Amino acid sequence: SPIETVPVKLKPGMDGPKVKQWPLTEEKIKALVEICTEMEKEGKISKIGPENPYNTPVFAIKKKDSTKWRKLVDFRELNKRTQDFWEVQLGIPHPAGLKKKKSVTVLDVGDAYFSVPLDEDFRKYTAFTIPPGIRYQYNVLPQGWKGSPAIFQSSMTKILEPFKKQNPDIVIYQYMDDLYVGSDLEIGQHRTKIEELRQHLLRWGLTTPDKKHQKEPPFLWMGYELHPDKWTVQPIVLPEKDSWTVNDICKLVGKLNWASQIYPGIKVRQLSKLLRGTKALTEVIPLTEEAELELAENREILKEPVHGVYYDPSKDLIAEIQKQGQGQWTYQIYQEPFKNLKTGKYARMRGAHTNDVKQLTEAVQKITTESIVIWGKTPKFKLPIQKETWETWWTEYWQATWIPEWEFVNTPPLVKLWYQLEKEPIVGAETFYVDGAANRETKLGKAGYVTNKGRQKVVPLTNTTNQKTQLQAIYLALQDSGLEVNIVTDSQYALGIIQAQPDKSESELVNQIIEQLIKKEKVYLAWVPAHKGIGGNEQVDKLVSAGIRK
Amino acid sequence: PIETVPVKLKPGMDGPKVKQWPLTEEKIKALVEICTEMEKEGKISKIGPENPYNTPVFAIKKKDSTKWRKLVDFRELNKRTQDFWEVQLGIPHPAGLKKKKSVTVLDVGDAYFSVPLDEDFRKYTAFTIPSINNETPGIRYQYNVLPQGWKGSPAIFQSSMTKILEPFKKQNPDIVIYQYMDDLYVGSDLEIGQHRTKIEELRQHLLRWGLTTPGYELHPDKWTVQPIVLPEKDSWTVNDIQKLVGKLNWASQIYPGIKVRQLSKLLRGTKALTEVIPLTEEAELELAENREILKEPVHGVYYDPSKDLIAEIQKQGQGQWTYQIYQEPFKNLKTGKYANDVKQLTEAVQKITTESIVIWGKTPKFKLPIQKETWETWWTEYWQATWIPEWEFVNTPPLVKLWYQ
RNA sequence: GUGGCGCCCGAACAGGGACUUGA
């Protein structure tokens, strides 16, 4: 290992910790001592007993594949002390970015971390002690380490960079400890370059087989299965339990969201509102008919098999949306019809009150983010919305909302504002001065309206602050009013809610507001202040203040 | 020959542990294509991941060019090392150029690339280009020399820039000069053609030392505020009066000489929002007082330099924008107007920031009416300058929009 | 025994909008 070893220091003005060894058994002891002998004669570990008074504890285990008591260690007292490194291996390589390459292969690594040495100004801090007892210190990168994957990938890239420049035609994707390698070349030359690569790496002391899974694939990869020209999730089922628990709910939710990225036409929303208030791990909740109809839908979708595709850089890619209602949004990505690359789900609630075009902008910008981080280019679009609506929205909106090149599709359902507002009042219409208040102590609010004719009104309410008071006030106004209307209030909250023009929201009263607002063909809205004596606004505020403002 | 200054952050100020937002391949290709050459000329250098600090990267294709240049978001670095250029090697700010007819911004980023830098400071300036789809980890690098987008490298470069500019401006006295960042300014209230002639002569004079230097042209002295004017329709509807009444009640905090008595007198008689209401002599007197007031500016505000600036912005419609500036709220300094959406926005922030540069010699803190992910994603394409402002995002009230129609 | 990523649920700080104690 003549590699370009790295200098590594410790945090500012600190020391290595000292701990006690744990109370353990007798059978694992000589076995892991033999493991230590094996790792030592492999040319890895330095044995030094009287070196320094450091004692990093040990947490051995009987791990999977019983009787293979592998070597293990704790480093929680040092990982907080080791100097930060950088980590760009945050996300994961999506199958889509993997390019269509015919001659594919793979080369895993055996005991990868145990082949790179470490810098002699740091081998002191690896006190692996065990029962007289005895100490043993690494010269290498051990596990439980904060900076081992970064150093590993850095040294691996700097090692194979000459191999890259020798054959840039060939693609090399790496990960934690694995090598996805491939090309579109013929097999006699593929295995030749691969053997040259093997000798290239074993020049630096690295492992690799020939009897691996090259024709044995599809692989299993973070829950994904990779055919050469296709791919799909690790195969999925769903439980047939007659009842449901919350663990059962979260299990299937995680499962289908791990399958939603390829499976079009999924619903989770009604299947996840159950968790609000559901916090115990034993509550037998029903399988309410919304969720029953949803999971029957989902199982119907899943009963058929499907496979994805890979990416070709030349053929420009397309996005599309098949909206399925109830504030939920799906999305397909395809370079050709019916050959979908990936799909997914988006039904987030940016603010409890919202409209559809806002959610659509949210969705397309998130899809642009994901398409950037996966492929590196935002796609051309195909959306179910007319241009005049987009023009009316961003002209009559108090923000900026851009989308890339796009076009129209005639795929029902459609997206459209179920109503609108005017910037100009009406002759022959009615005026409605409204207001409403409540108390912090009894919550027994009052609300009402008044006209210019005289047909006034007062209504009491309960268990609320003045915001929902004003909202129920305009509700009672619209219920007592007619066909067109011109309204005035004294709150910026109702205005900030309405002028966003929502078509769907959570609590039932704004739903009633919009439900009866759509009927009224025309409407104006305005705002005025209080404590100024502005016409009916004082009258109503006096009338509702009785029993409220004392 | 080189003897760099010992530079260091304020004690109790960590370095910039920052991520890197996503990038496109079309930019990454050019970024690699140019950083390799920068690395061959000894300007930068590869490293391992032994240092954790990072600083973002983003590409551009600016006006008056077609290349694929780059720059760096050094916002934290400047905010944390501001002591250096504030006391250690600082410079004063004049106030003569803003009253002059014409200026011309320059770009001298190449000269910075002929001077080394402190070795102890280089780890605080790591910049990662990413690799698509997390295939490969970042191709990390390190700055050996004084980089662009940082407000300490012109601070120490001013010393040799003084010896550079010595000869001509003793000859050419009436010109004022600034140096804020990689860009450079030149004050010239003279003929714009002669402005261009002397600009060409100066460019050649910089070329004499091997300096390559291939909005761009500006006219500040004619700028003024938009004095808030109001209609004069002899007819008035109650909607108009309510709107005006809320307008003045919100504006009271700005202008103390604000009275709405007679307008509130007309409202005790409730009626529709369409009848005519003749303004009395008293009420029209109050209007005339207000209109004579708003022709004037504020009296009582001043430019506190040691505080920070906040440059709020609003959208109106029709492709017409505004802007407001204040250190402390409701004490304005300059307002105005400026006519796809996001491109208008970056043009507007470029304009406003240049105005702030020439006037106060400082870049403000923004408050934009837009989401974070949208701007963070899309702003990288349409930008054309070589510096960065500080910004955040806001959830705009629909009454500040009633500032102007 | 430990760590990392995802999904869900809860506590602290800044901004904005509203109700009570004093000249």
Side-chain angles (χ1 to χ4, degrees), chain A residues 1-3 5-21 23-26 28-29 31-32 35-37 41 43 45 47 49-50 52-54 56-58 60-61 68 70-76 78-79 81 83-87 89-100 102-107 109-110 112-119 122-140 142-160 162-164 166-183 185-188 190-194 197-213 217-224 226-228 230-239 243-277 279-286 288-293 295-302 305-315 317-337 339-347 350-395 397-404 406-423 425-445 447-454 456-475 477-479 481-489 491-507 509-519 521-548 550, chain B residues 1-9 11-12 14-37 39-40 42 44-49 51-72 74-87 90-98 102-118 120-160 162 164-165 167-169 171-175 177-181 184-187 189 191-199 202-207 209-220 222-231 235-264 266-267 269-270 272-274 276-280 282-285 287-288 290-291 293-294 296-298 300-306 308-327 329-330 332-372 374-404:
Chain A
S1 181
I3 65 185
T5 178
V6 175
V8 169
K9 278 78 60 170
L10 202 44
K11 271 200 208 322
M14 290 292 197
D15 73 325
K18 51 190 175 198
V19 198
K20 75 181 170 298
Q21 192 261 314
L24 315 178
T25 77
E26 319 89 317
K28 328 155 172 172
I29 309 309
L32 60 94
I35 294 168
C36 277
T37 63
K41 64 177 164 275
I45 291 164
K47 59 185 293 173
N52 296 270
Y54 298 90
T56 320
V58 187
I61 204 181
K68 299 296 183 181
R70 296 153 53 205
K71 188 263 161 182
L72 177 63
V73 67
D74 176 77
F75 271 99
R76 211 158 77 161
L78 171 55
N79 58 353
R81 312 187 143 193
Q83 61 171 85
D84 289 345
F85 304 89
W86 174 238
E87 303 88 343
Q89 59 274 351
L90 272 174
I92 58 185
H94 215 82
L98 316 183
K99 317 184 177 158
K100 273 200 80 69
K102 311 156 54 53
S103 53
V104 76
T105 181
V106 61
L107 308 113
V109 194
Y113 298 86
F114 292 174
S115 178
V116 167
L118 193 48
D119 201 295
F122 214 85
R123 308 177 209 184
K124 172 177 74 74
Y125 306 82
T126 67
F128 180 64
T129 286
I130 197 76
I134 183 63
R135 315 195 165 271
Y136 289 97
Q137 64 184 15
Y138 288 102
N139 316 303
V140 293
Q143 321 312 135
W145 192 234
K146 190 185 174 187
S148 83
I151 291 173
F152 184 79
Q153 57 86 5
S154 56
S155 50
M156 182 67 74
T157 47
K158 73 171 52 52
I159 282 290
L160 59 91
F163 192 93
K164 297 290 294 304
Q166 170 71 3
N167 281 111
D169 54 326
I170 303 301
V171 175
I172 285 177
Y173 296 170
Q174 45 269 47
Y175 205 54
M176 306 278 194
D177 43 6
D178 300 325
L179 268 290
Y180 192 100
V181 177
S183 169
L185 271 282
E186 71 281 5
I187 294 144
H190 182 99
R191 271 73 159 288
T192 307
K193 302 311 189 191
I194 288 291
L197 182 60
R198 295 182 57 172
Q199 306 306 102
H200 196 139
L201 286 100
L202 195 38
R203 176 69 267 168
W204 276 280
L206 296 164
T207 81
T208 299
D210 194 281
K211 61 197 308 305
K212 64 218 165 300
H213 42 94
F219 309 84
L220 278 302
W221 185 277
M222 271 52 75
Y224 297 170
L226 311 179
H227 288 47
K230 288 192 191 177
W231 68 280
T232 189
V233 296
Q234 185 175 29
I236 211 74
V237 303
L238 177 63
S243 302
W244 300 122
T245 77
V246 303
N247 170 58
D248 289 345
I249 287 280
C250 310
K251 263 197 196 292
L252 67 95
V253 160
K255 288 221 300 181
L256 58 92
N257 268 316
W258 202 256
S260 52
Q261 57 198 324
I262 186 62
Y263 276 100
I266 309 288
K267 273 80 75 173
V268 63
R269 186 74 186 281
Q270 310 303 273
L271 200 45
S272 295
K273 256 193 295 185
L274 272 64
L275 314 187
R276 313 312 319 285
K279 60 203 81 63
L281 281 297
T282 299
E283 318 189 58
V284 172
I285 315 302
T288 75
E289 275 61 14
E290 316 100 318
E292 195 269 7
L293 62 80
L295 62 80
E297 298 259 48
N298 306 139
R299 293 194 163 179
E300 200 72 356
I301 287 283
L302 297 178
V306 71
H307 281 135
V309 287
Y310 293 75
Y311 177 45
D312 174 78
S314 80
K315 295 207 305 308
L317 79 170
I318 299 304
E320 194 169 324
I321 292 178
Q322 271 62 35
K323 165 157 146 53
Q324 52 193 26
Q326 320 318 127
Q328 298 205 58
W329 295 82
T330 59
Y331 71 110
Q332 297 175 333
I333 291 170
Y334 63 94
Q335 295 164 267
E336 289 292 346
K339 206 88 290 185
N340 61 332
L341 281 86
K342 50 152 280 178
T343 56
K345 170 65 58 75
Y346 176 50
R350 297 301 328 285
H353 305 253
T354 187
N355 55 61
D356 302 355
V357 306
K358 174 66 58 58
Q359 275 187 127
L360 191 139
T361 298
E362 307 281 331
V364 304
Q365 82 93 42
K366 156 167 184 292
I367 279 155
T368 299
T369 308
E370 207 170 9
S371 159
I372 284 161
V373 77
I374 281 176
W375 300 293
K377 46 188 292 182
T378 184
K380 186 184 160 198
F381 274 56
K382 274 188 184 295
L383 282 155
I385 186 182
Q386 197 60 213
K387 297 275 170 162
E388 68 93 5
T389 300
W390 188 252
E391 302 260 342
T392 297
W393 173 254
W394 66 251
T395 45
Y397 197 45
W398 47 273
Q399 291 185 339
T401 50
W402 190 48
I403 55 164
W406 64 299
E407 43 188 353
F408 185 52
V409 175
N410 188 247
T411 68
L414 288 175
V415 175
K416 54 169 180 176
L417 314 185
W418 274 120
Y419 60 95
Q420 71 189 31
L421 309 173
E422 295 302 320
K423 317 320 153 78
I426 296 98
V427 296
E430 199 82 44
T431 299
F432 282 84
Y433 289 64
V434 310
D435 204 330
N439 308 327
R440 268 180 297 172
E441 306 84 348
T442 56
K443 293 86 175 165
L444 295 174
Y449 76 89
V450 175
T451 82
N452 64 336
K453 310 180 184 280
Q456 59 162 304
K457 182 61 158 287
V458 186
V459 187
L461 291 192
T462 179
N463 192 15
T464 171
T465 59
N466 52 84
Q467 320 183 55
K468 305 184 297 322
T469 315
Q470 303 147 352
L471 285 147
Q472 297 223 46
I474 61 178
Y475 182 35
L478 295 152
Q479 294 161 275
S481 54
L483 295 174
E484 285 115 6
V485 71
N486 283 23
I487 307 172
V488 175
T489 178
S491 159
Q492 296 175 334
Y493 184 51
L495 189 64
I497 285 170
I498 294 287
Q499 276 184 338
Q501 312 177 31
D503 180 38
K504 185 51 59 53
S505 197
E506 319 308 323
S507 75
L509 62 80
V510 58
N511 306 147
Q512 296 153 264
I513 291 279
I514 65 183
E515 275 284 357
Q516 204 173 278
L517 185 135
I518 300 151
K519 306 161 173 54
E521 63 185 342
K522 322 197 85 183
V523 58
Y524 193 86
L525 197 56
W527 172 86
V528 286
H531 290 235
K532 306 289 157 291
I534 316 303
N537 177 85
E538 78 225 44
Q539 273 78 246
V540 299
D541 199 274
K542 273 174 62 178
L543 293 155
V544 296
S545 280
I548 306 286
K550 293 292 312 310
Chain B
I2 176 62
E3 286 91 44
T4 64
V5 177
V7 190
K8 46 169 189 298
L9 273 290
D14 207 333
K17 220 165 286 174
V18 186
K19 319 180 196 175
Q20 168 56 79
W21 68 75
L23 270 302
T24 81
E25 63 93 15
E26 179 155 295
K27 307 170 196 311
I28 285 160
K29 283 177 165 293
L31 277 151
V32 175
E33 288 219 307
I34 65 178
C35 65
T36 45
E37 280 69 352
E39 203 259 21
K40 287 158 56 157
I44 52 180
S45 188
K46 277 201 174 202
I47 49 170
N51 58 337
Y53 305 105
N54 204 318
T55 312
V57 159
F58 44 84
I60 49 169
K61 181 170 79 181
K62 53 172 167 50
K63 179 171 52 157
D64 202 341
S65 53
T66 189
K67 290 181 179 178
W68 274 103
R69 224 175 57 77
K70 85 186 190 306
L71 71 161
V72 190
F74 278 127
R75 294 175 270 112
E76 293 177 350
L77 211 66
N78 308 312
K79 277 165 64 175
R80 292 180 160 175
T81 196
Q82 90 184 109
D83 60 322
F84 187 96
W85 53 261
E86 200 59 274
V87 175
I91 43 177
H93 174 44
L97 77 167
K98 56 154 163 289
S102 280
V103 304
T104 293
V105 64
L106 267 291
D107 46 18
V108 286
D110 67 334
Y112 305 85
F113 303 155
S114 271
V115 173
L117 188 50
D118 171 73
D120 300 332
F121 189 63
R122 314 193 179 190
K123 59 197 293 291
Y124 302 115
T125 59
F127 70 115
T128 46
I129 66 186
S131 276
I132 185 57
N133 200 11
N134 310 329
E135 293 157 345
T136 314
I139 314 183
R140 289 173 66 83
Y141 280 99
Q142 186 182 49
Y143 272 96
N144 294 320
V145 303
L146 295 174
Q148 303 183 289
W150 191 60
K151 49 175 63 65
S153 83
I156 73 188
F157 195 67
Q158 69 94 54
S159 37
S160 79
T162 306
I164 283 157
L165 307 166
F168 79 98
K169 62 172 178 294
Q171 285 261 321
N172 315 124
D174 184 1
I175 283 174
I177 298 99
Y178 209 79
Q179 184 153 346
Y180 176 50
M181 288 182 78
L184 200 79
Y185 281 106
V186 54
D189 192 56
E191 195 259 331
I192 186 168
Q194 288 147 53
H195 189 129
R196 297 158 192 283
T197 70
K198 300 305 172 292
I199 278 293
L202 169 56
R203 287 154 66 79
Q204 306 257 311
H205 294 124
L206 290 113
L207 265 300
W209 279 258
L211 273 67
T212 299
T213 47
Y216 190 66
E217 318 184 4
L218 198 48
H219 314 75
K222 309 187 306 311
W223 293 332
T224 42
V225 312
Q226 190 73 36
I228 307 171
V229 289
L230 292 169
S235 42
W236 288 129
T237 81
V238 188
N239 188 343
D240 298 73
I241 311 309
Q242 292 158 301
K243 211 191 309 303
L244 170 59
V245 175
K247 207 157 154 183
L248 308 165
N249 200 58
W250 172 86
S252 281
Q253 302 88 294
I254 320 297
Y255 295 71
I258 284 302
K259 303 177 176 47
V260 50
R261 309 298 92 73
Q262 310 308 281
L263 292 100
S264 64
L266 320 182
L267 324 173
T270 310
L273 300 173
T274 46
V276 71
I277 295 94
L279 275 66
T280 76
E282 308 152 334
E284 152 75 340
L285 283 196
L287 275 66
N290 297 277
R291 284 170 292 185
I293 288 153
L294 297 188
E296 290 272 24
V298 185
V301 307
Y302 264 114
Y303 163 57
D304 195 344
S306 51
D308 201 335
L309 313 191
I310 287 171
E312 197 170 12
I313 197 173
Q314 277 76 240
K315 194 190 170 201
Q316 305 292 99
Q318 300 289 316
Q320 301 216 331
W321 295 78
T322 80
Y323 53 107
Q324 310 180 349
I325 298 164
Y326 47 87
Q327 305 171 335
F330 289 179
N332 295 6
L333 297 88
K334 188 171 223 302
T335 75
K337 186 187 67 210
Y338 166 48
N340 185 225
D341 299 334
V342 73
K343 170 167 178 167
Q344 308 176 23
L345 191 65
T346 189
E347 295 302 320
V349 300
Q350 212 176 52
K351 182 75 84 69
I352 290 152
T353 310
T354 299
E355 296 207 302
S356 167
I357 306 292
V358 298
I359 289 159
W360 296 292
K362 204 187 290 181
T363 57
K365 194 206 311 304
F366 276 100
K367 282 187 190 293
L368 315 188
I370 202 170
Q371 293 101 21
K372 173 153 89 83
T374 296
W375 181 247
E376 173 277 314
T377 286
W378 276 119
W379 85 270
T380 299
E381 273 270 314
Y382 289 76
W383 195 279
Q384 293 149 39
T386 78
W387 40 255
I388 294 293
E390 309 182 53
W391 66 76
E392 59 186 359
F393 312 106
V394 175
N395 213 282
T396 298
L399 176 52
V400 193
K401 179 166 174 294
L402 265 295
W403 170 277
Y404 187 79

